[PDB]
Amino acid sequence: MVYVSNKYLTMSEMKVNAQYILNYLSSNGWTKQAICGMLGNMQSESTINPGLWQNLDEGNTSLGFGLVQWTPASNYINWANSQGLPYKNMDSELKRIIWEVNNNAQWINLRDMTFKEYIKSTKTPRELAMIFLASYERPANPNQPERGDQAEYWYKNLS
Ligand SMILES: CC(=O)N[C@@H]1[C@@H](O)[C@H](O[C@@H]2O[C@H](CO)[C@@H](O[C@@H]3O[C@H](CO)[C@@H](O[C@@H]4O[C@H](CO)[C@@H](O)[C@H](O)[C@H]4NC(C)=O)[C@H](O)[C@H]3NC(C)=O)[C@H](O)[C@H]2NC(C)=O)[C@@H](CO)O[C@H]1O
């Protein structure tokens, strides 16, 4: 059971999605820390909503979409379509992230950590949130410490 929509999710809704993601990526060998650092980013990017378009601008494929706000959205949507997966879909988005780890896409090593190091890391969810921000997300504004607070909130509050 997950929320998928073009709307900002409440804390309770985010928690449902966030536990789903933790379960899913644990089976694909990520640490709880690495997953929570990424969750702290996804909260700021999309309120952890796989259905969410940047500015709630539905159908604008030039801008951000989905859990991590793939920009331009077409980078991701093209991949889903080309792969025969529905793009507006929790699992399709997690499959993209796994595909990126596997093919060393998206990640730029700015912090002397590779993506494959990242998903096996037991550094703090705060430290990982900051590394994921700098290496994977890379938004115009870089000092977004909120993302680390959030990573710690999910690590505490999920199972
Ligand atoms: C206002 C705001 O911040 N909007 C947010 C989005 O910016 C953000 O999405 C992320 O945006 C950045 C910057 O536009 C983007 O980072 C760029 O990624 C490309 C890789 O595709 C890099 O370009 C390549 O560089 C290498 C080496 O120089 C070349 O070999 C290659 O040819 C280049 N490819 C092309 C086609 O350009 C850029 O160097 C790099 N720029 C920066 C500043 O790092 C991220 O990939 C975007 N993130 C995601 C997840 O897609 C989004 C997420 O925070 O949120 C919006 O709010």
Choosing from 93, 138, 141, 144 the residue with most ligand 1 atoms within 8 A of its CB, the one to mutate for a pocket test is 138
Q: Alpha helix (H) ranges present in 90-143? A: 90-103, 115-119, 125-132
How far is Cα 121 from Cα 90, in angstroms, rounded to an integer?
A: 24
Instruction: Give the whole-angstrom CA distance, residue 88 versus residue 128.
Output: 27
Among the four given CATH numbers 1.10.530.10, 3.30.300.30, 3.50.50.60, 3.40.190.10, the one describing domain 1-159: 1.10.530.10
Contact assessment for residue 149 and residue 41, using Cβ atoms and an 8 Å cutoff:
no
Task: Count CB-CB contacts under 10 A for residue 91.
Answer: 13
- The answer to whether the CB of 18 falls within 8 A of the CB of 64 is no
The residue length of the chain stands at 159
- 135 CB less than 6 Å from ligand 1? no
Is there a cis peptide before residue 139, judged by omega within 30 degrees of 0?
no
**Which parts of 27-157 fold into alpha helices (H)?**
32-46, 73-83, 90-103, 115-119, 125-132, 146-157
Count of alpha carbons within 13 angstroms of residue 153, beta-carbon side? 17
Catalytic positions, please?
A: 45
The span from the CA of 154 to the CA of 25, in Å, is: 14
The answer for residues whose C-beta is within 8 angstroms of residue 102's C-beta and 6 or more apart is none
What technique was this entry resolved by?
Answer: X-ray
Using the mean position of ligand 1's atoms as its centre, give its distance from the Cα of residue 17 in Å. Answer: 26
93 is in an annotated binding site: no
Which tokens sit at 131?
């590394």
139 is in an annotated binding site: yes
Resolution in A: 1.8
